[PDB]
Amino acid sequence: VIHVTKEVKEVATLSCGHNVSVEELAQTRIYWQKEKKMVLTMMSGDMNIWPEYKNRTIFDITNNLSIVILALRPSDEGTYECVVLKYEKDAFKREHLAEVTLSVKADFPTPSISDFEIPTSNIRRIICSTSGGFPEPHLSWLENGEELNAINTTVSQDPETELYAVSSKLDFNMTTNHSFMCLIKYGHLRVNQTFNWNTA
Numbered sequence: 001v002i003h004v005t006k007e008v009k010e011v012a013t014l015s016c017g018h019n020v021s022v023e024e025l026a027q028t029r030i031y032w033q034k035e036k037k038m039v040l041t042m043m044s045g046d047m048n049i050w051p052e053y054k055n056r057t058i059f060d061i062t063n064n065l066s067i068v069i070l071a072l073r074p075s076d077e078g079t080y081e082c083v084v085l086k087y088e089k090d091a092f093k094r095e096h097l098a099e100v101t102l103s104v105k106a107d108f109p110t111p112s113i114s115d116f117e118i119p120t121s122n123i124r125r126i127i128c129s130t131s132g133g134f135p136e137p138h139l140s141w142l143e144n145g146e147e148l149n150a151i152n153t154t155v156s157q158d159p160e161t162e163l164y165a166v167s168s169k170l171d172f173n174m175t176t177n178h179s180f181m182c183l184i185k186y187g188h189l190r191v192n193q194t195f196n197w198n199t200a
């Protein structure tokens with residue numbers, strides 16, 4: 001395959017499009033690397049995966065020497081290339097090369113809104129939050145194609161999943177009718193939800 005696209009938290013199996021028996025594993029050299037930067041090395045019998053990858057990467061020898069990235073992160077994006085070399089008596093002549101580029105989708109689920117009264121005559125508060133997305137999200141409240149100011153807006157990124165979570169609060173006077181949209185931009189995409197407030 002040329003291109004591959006998986007979701008975040010999901011597994012990515014990048015095949016080397018080549019297989020090698022255990023007897024040959026001795027004489028064979030395997031170079032998996034992500035854009036010139038090494039990943040793992042199965043140097044003739046002895047394997048050694050770089051620290052950057054030690055944790056979330058598996059080397060599936062049995063399955064065409066593939067590398068399985070567990071718990072995908074938006075940064076795993078990139079072009080992987082797998083070169084295997086056979087020892088042509090006197091040297092190491094490479095007998096194969098596969099190359100695949102990996103895409104990682106990280107859409108933001110449609111945000112959900114909560115509404116409830118605060119201790120202030122007529123004022124109702126709404127909270128729009130969503131998460132599990134990438135890149136960093138940008139939340140904005142709309143009223144009549146106008147951008148209202150947000151009361152509170154937190155945005156953090158999980159060190160583990162490498163994913164974001166947004167949550168913003170907004171107040172409005174219950175006396176009038178209202179129709180707000182919570183727009184959330186992340187990259188060149190955008191997700192949203194609305195809130196209708198009918199007076200009496």
Ligand SMILES: *[C@@H]1O[C@H](CO)[C@@H](O)[C@H](O)[C@H]1NC(C)=O
Pocket residue numbers: 152153154
């Ligand atoms: C903003 O809202 C969050 C979540 O409700 C809360 O933890 C935080 O204290 C608020 N920030 C301020 C300055 O009140």
Ligand SMILES: *[C@@H]1O[C@H](CO)[C@@H](O)[C@H](O)[C@H]1NC(C)=O
Pocket residue numbers: 122123172173174175176
């Ligand atoms: C709430 O709405 C009423 C009716 O329009 C208005 O008199 C009052 O000043 C408003 N208060 C706030 C905090 O918006």
Ligand SMILES: *[C@@H]1O[C@H](CO)[C@@H](O)[C@H](O)[C@H]1NC(C)=O
Pocket residue numbers: 183190191192193
């Ligand atoms: C808000 O979300 C809806 C639901 O997917 C979408 O159809 C609409 O285009 C969005 N509106 C804007 C201004 O992004």
